[PDB]
Amino acid sequence: LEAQEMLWLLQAVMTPERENTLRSALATSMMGLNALDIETLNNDEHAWDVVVEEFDGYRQIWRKRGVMPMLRALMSARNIAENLLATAGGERRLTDILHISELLQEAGTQLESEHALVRWLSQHILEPDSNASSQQMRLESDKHLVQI
Amino acid sequence: FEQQLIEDESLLRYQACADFWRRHCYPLPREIAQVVFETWKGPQALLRD
Amino acid sequence: LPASFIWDMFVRVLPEIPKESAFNKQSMSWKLMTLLPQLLEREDFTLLRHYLTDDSDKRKLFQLSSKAADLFDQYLVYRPDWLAQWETGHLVEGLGEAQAWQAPLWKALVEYTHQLGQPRWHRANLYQRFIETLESATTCPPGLPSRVFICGISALPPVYLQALQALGKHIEIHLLFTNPCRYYWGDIKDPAYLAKLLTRQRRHSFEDRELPLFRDSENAGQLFNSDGEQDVGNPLLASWGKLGRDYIY
Amino acid sequence: TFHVCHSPQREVEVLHDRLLAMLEEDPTLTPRDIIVMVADIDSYSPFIQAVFGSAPADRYLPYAISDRRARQSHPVLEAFISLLSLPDSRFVSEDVLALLDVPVLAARFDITEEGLRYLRQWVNESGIRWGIDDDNVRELELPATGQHTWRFGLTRMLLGYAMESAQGEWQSVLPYDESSGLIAELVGHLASLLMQLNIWRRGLAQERPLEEWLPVCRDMLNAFFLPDAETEAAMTLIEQQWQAIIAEGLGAQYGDAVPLSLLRDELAQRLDQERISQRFLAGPVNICTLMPMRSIPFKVVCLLGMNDGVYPRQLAPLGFDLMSQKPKRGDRSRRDDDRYLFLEALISAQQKLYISYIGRSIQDNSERFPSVLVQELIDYIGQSHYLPGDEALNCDESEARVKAHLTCLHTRMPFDPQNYQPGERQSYAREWLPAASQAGKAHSEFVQPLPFTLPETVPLETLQRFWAHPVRAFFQMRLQVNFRTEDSEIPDTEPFILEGLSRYQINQQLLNALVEQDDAERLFRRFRAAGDLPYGAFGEIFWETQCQEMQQLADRVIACRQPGQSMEIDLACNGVQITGWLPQVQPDGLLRWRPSLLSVAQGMQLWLEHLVYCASGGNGESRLFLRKDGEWRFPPLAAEQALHYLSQLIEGYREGMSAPLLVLPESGGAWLKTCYDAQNDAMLDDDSTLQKARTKFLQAYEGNMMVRGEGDDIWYQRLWRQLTPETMEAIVEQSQRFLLPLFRFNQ
Amino acid sequence: AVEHKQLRPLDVQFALTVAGDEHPAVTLAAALLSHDAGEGHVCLPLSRLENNEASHPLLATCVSEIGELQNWEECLLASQAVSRGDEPTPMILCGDRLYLNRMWCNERTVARFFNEVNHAIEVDEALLAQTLDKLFPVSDEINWQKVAAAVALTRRISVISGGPGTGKTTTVAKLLAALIQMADGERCRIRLAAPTGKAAARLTESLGKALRQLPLTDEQKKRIPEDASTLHRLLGAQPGSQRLRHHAGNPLHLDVLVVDEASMIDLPMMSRLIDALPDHARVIFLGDRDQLASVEAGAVLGDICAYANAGFTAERARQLSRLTGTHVPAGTGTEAASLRDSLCLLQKSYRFGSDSGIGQLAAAINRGDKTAVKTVFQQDFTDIEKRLLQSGEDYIAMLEEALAGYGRYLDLLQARAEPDLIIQAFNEYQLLCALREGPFGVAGLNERIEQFMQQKRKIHRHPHSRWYEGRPVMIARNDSALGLFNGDIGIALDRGQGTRVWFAMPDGNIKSVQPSRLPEHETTWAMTVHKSQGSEFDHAALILPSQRTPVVTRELVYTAVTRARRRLSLYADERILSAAIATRTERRSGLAALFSS
Amino acid sequence: AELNAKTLQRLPGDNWRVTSYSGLQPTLTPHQFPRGASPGTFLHSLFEDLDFTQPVDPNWVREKLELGGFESQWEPVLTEWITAVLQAPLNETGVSLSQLSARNKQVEMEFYLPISEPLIASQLDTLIRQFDPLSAGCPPLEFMQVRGMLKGFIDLVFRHEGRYYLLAYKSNWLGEDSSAYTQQAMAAAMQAHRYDLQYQLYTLALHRYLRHRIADYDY
């Protein structure tokens, strides 16, 4: 599901004009918002204006600096990494998000267009084939876990 | 001297199985294609076999 | 660059030289694409007849011609004496099995480029012509600079040193050499060459004091082995600097 | 210093922090005196650009990366290479839509981006899979089917532009009712492309001599491409490389024929010959490989990618070269060159040397060995130096202590609290400081009590969309969040079997045709003219078994079928107005038929229709006939019980808008029908039923490896990640509260 | 035409695919039919194919039969691509006019809807006359609005033809008021349809300000029509598929349906609207007869209202005299009594009379060009000005007059006032151009106006910011979430919280939107004539190119004249204005033959 | 345990960059030539590769147009335009380009000019406007403080009768087709394209090179 959330976030960053994709991407488990937060964001127009402005700034960073600076600024401003680390069971999801971000950076450094990386991510979501780089890594190494 | 290595040969194998199914199962009459359908639904079942 | 400077000296010293060589890599590949089916009937190419006449849509022939052109360009850069012997028609004693299909191929390449309207000249023969026209010349030819600086080891590959010694008779050449050690750490050829190396010393550029090449000149023969390899005390310099060994040699 | 890392991204992330620490420690340290040489610049420079572009304004140091030169127009050269492989291509629809993905080829044939978005679904829905012409199918030693080709789809789209789909077939080709107006002019652009794809397929097939390949690339460039402001240099480079290939071929005076694949491979090799950059900028920090500045005296020298296998690079010999058999002094070799580059990098380091390699794998935490040069270096360090702590302990033990002290084993993740402890190593990442401090709030629960006032007029369609899926109705209507998934790509072959939505649409149209006793053979020819059926006898066998199943269903459907019309429903329940329309209301009652399986959602829909039908007159049963002799029956009830159950459903609807009403239809209905007893009208409380209902709930929630379960859904994964027993008991209680009249009145 | 000779690749591929191995006569006929369908002509007459084609004897040498295939009908019926309406063929030849199968089906559907289903609903005439006397205050002379309301409430299907400024919305309000006051116990689910969203918003605000003025009852105010819907939204059109929700099976549960702006309704949308209607709904069409043609291929309203010049029937004249209580004239002759009875013509304009030159110029557009020259020439009626545009100095004079046109807008912009007065001043003056690119177009005039505002100190513009204070923008796609429709103008300015675009909503409010929230944004200093339909401007200025183009015709100048409320300016050559009036955009269709029998 | 991220006290580096001048800022006629960056670089390469002493050959111009990819009809007008340019002298005494030998010319001289002070635009533009007469208008450009190296590529440096001269080429010229390119229009083009700083840096680089190379040098 984290790849689908990253695809929704990239579609919200690439197309921030239509509010449907942004509303579908903000309510994902990566952002971590309640139903009251989504309702107050849909009711208050000024907060949605601030969200659209900061997503346009994220799109400017994505066009100027790249994929991983944009994702790092998004994870630092929204502070979703600390919330996923505080949530029990979110460390595996955060490592999956970081690995998906690294693969998206590796695929977007070779691609010129910005929508081509979104199409590549949608195609790799539609293609579940197993490569040596695109496998799931270990979530944590310092914490002792029962190894199946 | 220069050759490109492909990791996954499942796509070319499925394409060759589809070509075999096209060149064999298509000009058959009904009395043979009934038995071919009773053995396998499509070329994917034969490839899985 | 060193090849660009060598070609510029070739243009300036020797006149009536074409700007592009006839022995280009792609040119030799396109020539060997035409010459190799003509030589399939020959007895020396019987290794290639089992390689080419089985199934060919001119794909194996093009790659074989490209690899043979790469080897011929590498021989033009590094081994001029082998091609000079192969142009006469004589083999070289002591080489591998892959020689009976390369020397008639090189001779047929020379005959094909001589039969065509393309010029005879390539890098290897013009190198020897440059050495001959710089060694026998008493008067310095015009168009040459005053002093030439060579900064670094890879700023000249170790094959143009004879042309550099020929250029040093008329042009002051300052080769700024970056060696990690200050003594002599390379190899040796003969004990009669060891005394010739011991007679040479390095004087200081600013202090004007001569220093010997070795730490102990009396034990310089004990450092070199009978085969000709010096036991370097530093293991990193012995294991890492073999190109530096050949360059200082 | 030697630094063991787990990831190359983590390697350059530790490198950036250590370079910032070296810049902060030494005030007389300019950034121009720092150099980072990587052994593999192709697999590291994305990570270097990523972790050096992500720095904040108070942390940003300037960087300039030297790598291989990118193409001036990356899709255009690949499109020209694919156009050079035109007779060898199979003309798959995705391979042509990728050629239309390039804006140059789209702007040549006047195809816009909106036109491309229309052409995507126009190719996907009209059955265009592979094959430009039927002669292309016959050329590949395949039987000429005549369908699922580009000519078939072009004739289908033109017949749809000319004739509506309700008229019928003309030349065994069903028309395509989408492209009808002026937008089908874009179809006239697409057929303008494939005709060009018919020209160069038959032209580039025959072998030509080198004097005839000259205007070929120029004609291809003015046929398929249009000169824009950006892609002038790409077409200029293509023409220059092609004319250079032909000039170097004609310089040798080649007379025999030269095939297309040789020139295509030579152009593909001469377009990927972009050499690694050797430029040095004195402004920013230079990121480059080993060769460019072998002797430059930089103060801070970093060496990345010093693991085994990558560095030093071992180049395999050609096998028949005489220089490899007999080596001389002036012989170029990559191994000795790299081993001397490492020595020159060691000598050229003036103040600080920072060697980092991959010591541990990130996948399975396997031990990775470094290079042999770094191993000899740390062996010489351990055998040449000792720490003042153990002045006289041993020789091997002091060597191991020195090699362990110099080796910094960094953490695997950047949010590790080990990196933020004060002492020797301390990171500068302020963004990962509160994440490593673990002083953040956790993810709160999604269900929150929201204020919701029930309106006066609530339609029946809203109640049907609510009771079809309650969590989806809570997401897409209350907070208006609908998770939009991307559509599936076009398959690479014709449909041999019927499965999924296509089989269900074929069964639905066959059931709607057989309910009026229409000719099944006309619908068979209509479905075969569209290519939705398999070719030849297999499509006939599929249509025969589906006609047998739909006739078995229709013999039960039209056994008790009466002509009925749609009626209006106006109800007032709990002060709430319900306005709607019920289709095909017969005097016998309610008659619905769908080609699906026995499920609880269709039973809930039929129960809601029966409640909205019996509340305003209508004494009679309600019947629904599914496949495999599945039947939902509800007896007629009075107005009191119907209004009571409708008020219960209205209360559930107004409860579902405030909080997400956790009523699973399938799993809750399975749990209920495992626990319900229709004979005594009482629920069993023994432990055997409580153990079998849990098994039914786990069977219906998470299905097998062949059937998609109810838990594999994007609406349920947002609420919970793992099905807890507390939420399971909550779903059980809500299904016992709501889904009980489904199995109470079932007969 | 010139565009008709340059063949589109769609027509060539259609001719090569449909005919194929047949004769080249069928290929040329299919190519000409596809080109006429692309240009907008519904039917193709065989006389134009026989006479106006140079290859017509050559194909006579191509065919070889016993009868030699001298007729075009036998040559078309000999091939398998053309049938008489029985075989499922792409091309249909029925009445010596070749069309496509979809166009033939839609034309027969329109002819069936306008020839057979239009029956006469018989109601009480005394109560209808009493409601018309109590609603319409004028009862002394002939009023076309009262006759239009009577003939719309009498028949089921009725077409109301009238120009702008004639009080059509007041007639619709009186018609709906008399419709509810006639049927008291019977419920009426009135529905309103529009082709565009902006015209739907204008219809909602107009009927809201019109129906609240008339005195109603508590049950009558409950049956007020709530909203006007788009025609794609009323039938349930999808972006991906063309499947409708109310296509053939379940009709729309409506009692009466008022469809405004029928001039922009093409033939497939009209045929899809007809198939969705039940057997009891009464439809009232609104629009102008001489207005601009539809977007796609087809001309429904013009071919319907072409029979309005003949008049009514002899019995229908006495019926209208008994209904309205006045003297209603009769039409000479009877060809199709149902369609001529269902039509009506509005001639009395209330917002402008014979004293104003705008209505006289609009009446002279449908006449010869000398009538328009005489209308502009003598004394100009203090309303219409004519400026000749040939060279660069005329362009500078046009920009100088546009400075005086946008003078109040710049004065309210520079004074830092409220944005409502700024939008109210911007909605009074408007430039209307024909083309898009080049020196004469949308993007040419917008960039020239921006460069002129960069030259003179009126508007400060940063070259890299693209969102300077004072730019007018317009949206190209609809957006129901933001409340803005296609063809709505917004003004970008700084209220103090940043550069935001203010839009004037039809509900009386002003909405400040972020420029990053706009899906589409194009500069609208000069609008196209096709995209300015439905709106109204106080001072309009038409700009026509000197080069001959098929866009500039009689209907374009007619829509440009009727776009102005009071003042109208022209920047065109005299020869172009003389040639555009005579060249009428005719669309050949089979409705002229089907309604004549 | 407690943990804090380190705060950087000093900036990692000053504003150092290797920049240039551009970083701180009938039917066949030359008026109908296509105006762009690529035809300008093509004409610059044509003026670089052609020898000034040797006469212009039309087949050589045809070969250069075949190598570049331009039209073949422009060639007989191009060679006569090239000879008309080469016949026109450009000096205060009337020295043509044909009088320059191969030893006297130096084509495309690259220089790296060092600067250790922070280059302030306000302190430099006033010093430029104090002496340059073309700086009457031309509001000053804005650029950051550049400490480091300045790159430059001079088109031609040539000596004649014991006096050195610098020569540069500009070839865009899109907006002029008549004979209106007088000294006023060329001065307006110099003020608009801001070529005063480039020629001033070229004079500074040539003065430093002649001071370093030639002993007892006077400007």
Side-chain angles (χ1 to χ4, degrees), chain E residues 15 22 52 73 105 117 141 148 187 222 258 269 398 409 411 441 502 511 533 542 545 555 588:
Chain E
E22 293 287 335
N52 299 20
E73 289 184 335
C105 180
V117 208
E141 57 114 12
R187 51 143 52 184
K222 194 182 104 298
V258 183
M269 288 301 300
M398 182 187 62
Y409 170 74
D411 285 0
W502 294 83
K511 187 174 183 178
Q533 305 186 221
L542 179 63
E555 284 81 13
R588 310 144 193 170

Side-chain angles (χ1 to χ4, degrees), chain E residues 156-365:
Chain E
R156 171 181 179 180
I157 309 162
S158 59
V159 179
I160 300 179
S161 301
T166 62
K168 295 185 299 300
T169 318
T170 314
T171 316
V172 171
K174 292 301 184 60
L175 170 67
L176 291 184
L179 201 145
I180 302 176
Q181 284 178 359
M182 179 56 190
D184 300 329
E186 304 178 5
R187 51 143 52 184
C188 300
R189 294 177 295 182
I190 318 179
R191 206 70 173 184
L192 312 161
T196 57
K198 188 61 179 180
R202 292 174 191 271
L203 184 61
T204 51
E205 64 165 348
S206 299
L207 287 181
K209 297 307 173 184
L211 287 180
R212 288 296 182 177
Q213 186 183 357
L214 304 182
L216 310 180
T217 344
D218 292 70
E219 58 175 356
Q220 185 160 11
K221 284 178 298 181
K222 194 182 104 298
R223 291 179 172 88
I224 284 180
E226 304 188 314
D227 231 7
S229 60
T230 331
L231 200 64
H232 298 259
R233 202 184 185 272
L234 181 61
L235 307 183
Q238 317 298 322
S241 300
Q242 291 297 133
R243 178 59 61 180
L244 305 180
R245 308 302 295 269
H246 308 273
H247 42 279
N250 40 270
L252 16 81
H253 315 281
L254 312 175
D255 180 69
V256 275
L257 174 61
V258 183
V259 181
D260 196 5
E261 299 289 331
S263 179
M264 294 181 292
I265 301 300
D266 45 320
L267 188 65
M269 288 301 300
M270 173 60 67
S271 67
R272 284 157 56 181
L273 180 58
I274 283 163
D275 201 16
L277 289 160
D279 304 0
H280 61 274
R282 297 194 278 100
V283 193
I284 295 102
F285 286 142
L286 316 175
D288 201 0
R289 171 178 55 89
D290 307 321
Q291 221 180 349
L292 200 51
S294 59
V295 178
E296 293 186 1
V300 181
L301 192 59
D303 291 339
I304 283 300
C305 301
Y307 288 157
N309 300 272
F312 309 101
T313 345
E315 188 178 359
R316 279 301 176 179
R318 293 183 287 103
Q319 175 70 27
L320 289 172
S321 74
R322 287 177 301 180
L323 283 174
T324 60
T326 50
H327 174 265
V328 181
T332 60
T334 298
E335 186 76 21
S338 60
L339 189 61
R340 288 179 56 178
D341 138 80
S342 300
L343 280 169
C344 185
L345 182 58
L346 298 179
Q347 300 179 355
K348 179 59 181 179
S349 58
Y350 290 89
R351 290 194 172 186
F352 50 91
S354 60
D355 305 329
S356 180
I358 305 299
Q360 192 70 28
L361 233 180
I365 278 303

Side-chain angles (χ1 to χ4, degrees), chain E residues 459-472:
Chain E
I459 290 179
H460 181 267
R461 169 189 183 187
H462 297 270
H464 60 87
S465 179
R466 210 56 200 273
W467 283 107
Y468 62 97
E469 176 180 0
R471 49 168 305 183

